[PDB]
């Protein structure tokens, strides 16, 4: 009842719904439904995830040492490619 | 166990109706048995060993 | 750079990423149910419900 509202109303980007979302695909899916692209200034910034914020948040604010890259490399490739960071995803996949 | 409800809910109801009694190890043995008899029908090896 | 910066194309990347993640969970929920059919009680009615 939290998670379905956090999706449909794009609210509490500050909650991960981790009593339902145990996994990285469900974290990606939750936050990707929470994305806006649109500068509607009636939205408060504490509810306001842009794709650009989420791209940086994976690549720079968590990074390759959060996703345990040597043990789950295709999961970090999945994280970058499903956030359309294709150039960084290729630079990564070309190191291994 | 036969008609395949989960025993966990009736095992807990049998405890509220007891102020403090033995009615616990029979309920644990019943859950241990529920999982064992389900393992016999389960065809996913991973699930069966789980 | 103008195609990758478009609002429309960045909506399309996220619309496809959500479709991939949803069909991924559809594969996982299918496999989970088809292994455990005796618990699952799937019956004889097709559909995601």
């Amino acid at each position: 009842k939290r998670a379905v509202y956090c999706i449909i109303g794009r609210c509490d980007v500050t909650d991960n719904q981790s009593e339902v979302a145990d996994k990285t695909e469900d974290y990606l899916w939750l936050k990707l439904n929470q994305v806006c692209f649109d500068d509607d200034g009636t939205s408060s910034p504490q509810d306001r995830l842009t794709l650009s914020q989420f791209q940086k948040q994976l690549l720079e604010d968590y990074g390759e040492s959060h996703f345990t890259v040597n043990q789950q490399p295709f999961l970090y490739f999945q994280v970058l490619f499903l956030t359309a960071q294709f150039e960084a995803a290729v630079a990564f996949l070309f190191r291994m | 166990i036969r008609d395949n409800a989960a025993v966990d809910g009736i095992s807990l109801h049998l405890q509220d109706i007891c102020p403090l009694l033995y009615s616990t190890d029979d309920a644990i043995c019943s859950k241990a048995n529920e999982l064992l008899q389900r393992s016999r029908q389960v065809q996913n090896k991973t699930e069966k060993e789980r | 750079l103008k195609n990758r910066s478009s609002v429309e194309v960045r909506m399309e990347f996220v619309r496809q990423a959500l479709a991939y993640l949803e069909q991924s969970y559809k594969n996982y929920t299918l496999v989970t149910v088809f292994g455990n059919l005796h618990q699952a009680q799937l019956g004889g009615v097709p559909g995601t419900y």
């Binding site: 981790s18 996994k23 469900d26 974290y27 959060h66 789950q72 | 991973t46 789980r50 | 969970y25 996982y28």
Partner: peptide, 24 residues
């Protein structure tokens, strides 16, 4: 808390076993 989990959905399917030689 705000940081992600590091797991796929297929982790429930990839449980330990022989991986190989599928008979019957």
């Amino acid at each position: 808390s705000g940081a992600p989990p590091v797991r796929s959905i297929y982790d429930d399917i990839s449980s330990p076993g022989l991986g190989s030689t599928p008979l019957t």
